[PDB]
Every structure is written in structure tokens, then in C-alpha cells.
């Protein structure tokens, strides 16, 4: 599948607030589709989708989400609560003169596009998540309660400074370690809080996943030199704010065209978690990629492309 | 008509070759429209069109043309021959994944979009020029012939690199307050320039503020031209022989795509008359004509320009 050379892309910049600019990559003509990567990724994560969606007849905007790459990384933890992040994407649409977009998210980006679709449906022509379910907040169930102990690692991510040091230690190590097919996996997310690290019981000089080249790893590396891992990590550090915000919607369905794409071998965002999203989302269509781990876009680019274009052309165009 | 705050625009950047990026401002959704300013202007020259075209249902890309503002100003004179400038706009479309655009130009921008439409029609949905006619190159008539065949004598003053740069860079506020005037406010004679040895030599020291334009607006132009100065901009004038020999290599071939010529009654350089026989060369040409409009068409008569463009866009291009 045709990929992206960063040097050859149209680079877009939009100030959504005084010291906060959002960077995006833009390709194609037709309906606006806005791709929102997850943790700890990049617009480059969409390198296989961008050329295909443009060819399919769509105007693709591939974000650096706030904290990442060429998008500002404001120092305040509370800048990365979903509330702020969503208002800033709405301001993004306003400044580009877009009445709406299709929002397609993965991982943390998937949680953003669910919450755009929940609170700003008038601005979202249709919504799609890779891996990430939309589970409504239980107002009787606090977040620290919810940590589903697969999610214990989120506690290690809480204390500012701590996980930054691990992840910034050796950037090549970090990304070679993370960006693996599920069968190649070198770390257990279940173990993290105990071991006191993601990487403490993983190879010193990890090998290169079949999903990725050295050059692709060095691009991620080069990006995360700019602002590091604090910004990215701060998405984890607004559980109480996000919970209280999400509760303030409580009950209201998402009536816009919707797509949930599950990955058989994401052991964190497991297909099952998405099971009763129809109750909360009447017009939900489904994709499901077999032999696909967390890193859905680069694990199974051709599958992702065929599912998205099929749903786009049927539900959004 | 709603204008533009630069700080609030989406800013776009595209490398069309190693040391050469094009900057543009982007607003709206629907068919791609690409606005190409003239000399010596800016994307900001389209500040009254951009919000209106976006509102009208169009995706507007408002260029800094090569040499201007945030677009690269490569030092070589022949980088600003029409050939290169057009190839680079085609590369601009390629890198944005656009099969075509509507091209709307003014002045030198107008000459670019005529030549895009001539040599790259497959990439141009439809073409519109403000003020600038499309006169085919006569292969029996050299460029230096066409000029001193006379209103265009000032183009000779623009030739020698360094010379006109010094006048125009002397005092940027002076330059822009002096130029951006309604034709009744005019403080220049363009026909005099070669004689007097200057644009401004016989014009006020501290010129007054044209009714067309505010201090803020002038200071934006000023701020932009600090980046690269006037060499890049002026180098569009310095490729007459190259442009002539290039344009002759099209000789005869008509422009079969939807086209719009907009004449300004009071542009005394790009005069309505010059556009008179463009039908022969362009079968599908529709026409606008703005009364009481000088050279600086977009800011002189924003509401007229907007109504003509959107009418033609909606009828001929969408
Ligand atoms: C259901 C989950 C949502 C939001 C949400 C929670 C956690 C994550 C998250 O940690 N994503 C990163 C991740 C995911 C899977 C992995 O598999 C190996 C690894 C990672 C990680 F390495 F941390 F980047 C992403 C989204 C919620 O909390 O409601
Ligand atoms: C017919 C003209 C075309 C190309 C062409 C020639 C000249 C110009 C040009 O000098 N435009 C700038 C200009 C125009 C009118 C003016 O009236 C006050 C003043 C200017 C100027 F001050 F020079 F910027 C712009 C385009 C050709 O050569 O075929």
C-alpha cells in the first residue's frame, strides 16, 4: 500500500489558542476526513491510509494531536483533558471553515472522536474508531475504581516525570519495543505497575518488528525529540476531569453515522469491550480485523483501508 | 465584506523542490479555488474574497506566490520565468492530491493562471483573470518591441537587478501607501517612470492613506516584504525573453476550459481595451467589468469582485 514521504506532504498549521498550534498533513479533495492518532504515535501512523483515502475521493487531514510532533505541547496537565482537546478540534474546524468533518480515530484519538461525536455531533458528519470502544461513564463508578486491571499501567503513567524518564531514556528502544505485532510483543501491560516499568524486563537492544522499517522508527524518534513524552502522557492524567465531563452527557445517544473497528489481538482495547455500543449508538456499523494487534494502521494497512473506504463511501459521501 | 485576520487562518506549506516551499492560506470546503496575487502583493490581497468564496461553498487556497511573504524567494532570476512558476504550481496541486483547481489570478497572478490554463488545462477546472488579459505571443514581435512599441516603459526600469529594489525597499510604508490607491488617489505616473528614473521620485515624502486601506493592512504588507524584499517579486519582470519563447511554443492553440476575464475601467496599465479579442483565442470566455475600479481590484471593489466570481464559479465551475 502506497505510504507517505513526510518531506512531500502539505503541512498545515492552525492556532486554536494563544500558545497552542495544531499541525496536520493534508491530501486529496472531496469530503473532509480528520485522522486522530493515539498514544504514543504521530500523523505518520496514518501513512498507509492517507494516500488511499485521498485516491478514494476524500480530503484527508492527518493530525499531530496536541503534545505530539509539530503540534504545540503546552506544559499544563489539564490542557490534555478531553474537554479542552475536543473544544480545540472544534476551533480547528472553525479556522479551516469546515461545517463538519468525518472524524476517524485510533486509541486515545479514538476516544477523542467518540467524544467529538457525543458533544459536537453537528460538526461530525460521521465517526469511526480503531480499537477504542465508546463506554459511557458510570457516575457511581469513579475512574480509580475502574482500574479492569489490564489498565494498572495507567497508574505508573500518573506521576509526572516517572514514565517520561523510562520512555525518553532511549527513543529507538521505546519505539522498536512498542510498535510490534501481538506475536512479537516484548512487554506485558498487565505487569507494568509491579515491575515498575514498561521495559525493565524487555530486551536492551530490541529487534525490528515486521510491521516497520528502521527509517520509520527514526521518524517517530525524530518527532518525540521535540516535546518528549509528558504531553502525550498527560492524556492519561485527566481521568477525574474526563469522567466528570463525560457524566455531564450521561444517557444521550450518538445518532450520527458510526463505525467501530475491532482488532482480534489488541489485548488492551479487546474487541469484547465494544460489545453493547449499539444500545448507546443506533446507527453503528462494524469492522473487525483478524490477526491485528494494537497498532492497527501499520499492522493491517490494506484491511483498515478497505473497511474505512467501504463505510465512508456508503455512510458519509 | 468580512476580511481576514492572518493569526486565525490555516497556514499551508508545500515544498515543490529542494529549497522552494509555497505558503498558502486555506479556508472552506467544496471545489478547490486557487487565488494567485499579482505584483507586489500577497495572499492578504484576497482578504475580502477568501471569507466570501468559502461561505459560497468553495475550498480557497490563497497563495504567497514564489518570491513573496512565506513562500521561498530563490535567488536565481530564471526561477521566476512563467515556465518554472507554472510547473511549480502543478507540483503544488500534485503534493496536495488535487486533480485540478479553479485558478483565479490578478495582475502577474492573472498571467500565471492564463498560462496554467494554456499549458496545463487538464489541471485547471476553470480560469479567471482580474485586469490581466491573455494576449498570445506574436513570434514576429519580440518583448523589447512590445514595451517600447509604451505605458510599459517602467518594465525597463525593473530590469537591472538591485536598482528598483533600492527605491522600493528604501521605505516600505512609503512604497505601499504610494501603490495601494484608487486611480483618482494616484500619486504615480507609470508612463513617466523610465524618464524620471523612479516610481516615487515625483511623489509625496509622507503619502496619505488611501480610502481603500487602513494603517494595520499596510503594516502587514510592510512586515511581509521585510522577509525577502523586492528582488523575487521583481524577477517576474526579468524573464521576458524566456516567457516569450515559451509562450510561442503554444502558438495557435485555444483555451477550451471555462474562462472569465474581469476588466477594471480605471486600471490605466491593464486597460479594458487590451482584452478586446480574447474570444477568438478562448471560445468559452464569460466577462465581468467593474466600473470605478483601478488596478488594485480586490480591495478597491471587494463586493463587486465577490459577486462576479461567485456568480461565475456557481454557473461555470461547480
Ligand atoms: C477503554 C480505554 C479508554 C481510553 C484509553 C485507555 C488506554 C489507552 C492506552 O493505554 N493506549 C496505549 C496502548 C494500547 C495498547 C497497547 O498494547 C500493547 C499498548 C499501549 C501503549 F504502549 F501504552 F502505548 C488508550 C485509550 C478509557 O479509558 O475509557
Ligand atoms: C499585459 C501584461 C502582461 C503581464 C503583466 C505586465 C505588467 C504587470 C504590472 O506591472 N503590474 C503591476 C502594476 C500594474 C498597474 C499599476 O497601476 C497603478 C501598477 C503596477 C505596479 F505598481 F507596478 F505594481 C503585470 C502583468 C504581459 O506582459 O502580457
UniProtKB/Swiss-Prot annotation, chain B:
Functional description taken from the UniProt entry: Bifunctional enzyme. The C-terminal domain has epoxide hydrolase activity and acts on epoxides (alkene oxides, oxiranes) and arene oxides. Plays a role in xenobiotic metabolism by degrading potentially toxic epoxides. Also determines steady-state levels of physiological mediators.
Organism listed in the record: Homo sapiens (Human)
Activity control note: Inhibited by 1-(1-acetylpiperidin-4-yl)-3-(4-(trifl uoromethoxy)phenyl)urea (TPAU), 1-cyclohexyl-3-dodecylurea (CDU), 12-(3-adamantan-1-yl-ureido)-dodecanoic acid (AUDA), 1-((3S, 5S, 7S)-adamantan-1-yl)-3-(5-(2-(2-ethoxyethoxy) ethoxy)pentyl)urea (AEPU), N-adamantyl-N[']-cyclohexyl urea (ACU), 4-(((1S, 4S)-4-(3-((3S, 5S, 7S)-adamantan-1-yl) ureido)cyclohexyl)oxy)benzoic acid (c-AUCB), 4-(((1R, 4R)-4-(3-((3S, 5S, 7S)-adamantan-1-yl)ureido)cyclohexyl)oxy)benzoic acid (t-AUCB), 4-(((1R, 4R)-4-(3-(4(trifluoromethoxy)phenyl)ureido)cyclohexyl)oxy)benzoic acid (t-TAUCB) and to a lesser extent by 8-(3-((3S, 5S, 7S)-adamantan-1-yl)ureido) octanoic acid (AUOA).
Modified residues (N6-succinyllysine): 192, 226
Presence of keyword Transmembrane helix: no
Enzyme Commission code: 3.3.2.10, 3.1.3.76
Record-annotated active site: 107, 237, 295
GO biological process: cholesterol homeostasis; dephosphorylation; epoxide metabolic process; phospholipid dephosphorylation; positive regulation of gene expression; regulation of cell growth; regulation of cholesterol metabolic process; response to toxic substance
Binding site for substrate: 154
Region (Epoxide hydrolase): 7-318
Positions of post-translational Phosphoserine modification: 142
Residues covered by the AB hydrolase-1 domain: 31-302
Designated name of the protein: Bifunctional epoxide hydrolase 2
Parent-protein residues present: 229 to 547 of 555
Cofactor needs: Mg(2+)
Entry's localization field: Cytoplasm; Peroxisome
PTM info: The N-terminus is blocked. The covalent modification of cysteine by 15-deoxy-Delta12,14-prostaglandin-J2 is autocatalytic and reversible. It may occur as an alternative to other cysteine modifications, such as S-nitrosylation and S-palmitoylation.
GO MF annotation list: 10-hydroxy-9-(phosphonooxy)octadecanoate phosphatase activity; epoxide hydrolase activity; lipid phosphatase activity; lysophosphatidic acid phosphatase activity; magnesium ion binding; phosphatase activity; protein homodimerization activity; toxic substance binding
Keywords: Acetylation, Aromatic hydrocarbons catabolism, Cytoplasm, Detoxification, Hydrolase, Lipid metabolism, Lipoprotein, Magnesium, Metal-binding, Multifunctional enzyme, Peroxisome, Phosphoprotein
Catalysis performed (reactions): an epoxide + H2O = an ethanediol; (9S,10S)-10-hydroxy-9-(phosphooxy)octadecanoate + H2O = (9S,10S)-9,10-dihydroxyoctadecanoate + phosphate; 12-phosphooxy-(9Z)-octadecenoate + H2O = 12-hydroxy-(9Z)-octadecenoate + phosphate; 12-phosphooxy-(9E)-octadecenoate + H2O = 12-hydroxy-(9E)-octadecenoate + phosphate
Lipid-linked residues (S-(15-deoxy-Delta12,14-prostaglandin J2-9-yl)cysteine): 293
Inducing stimuli: By compounds that cause peroxisome proliferation such as clofibrate, tiadenol and fenofibrate.
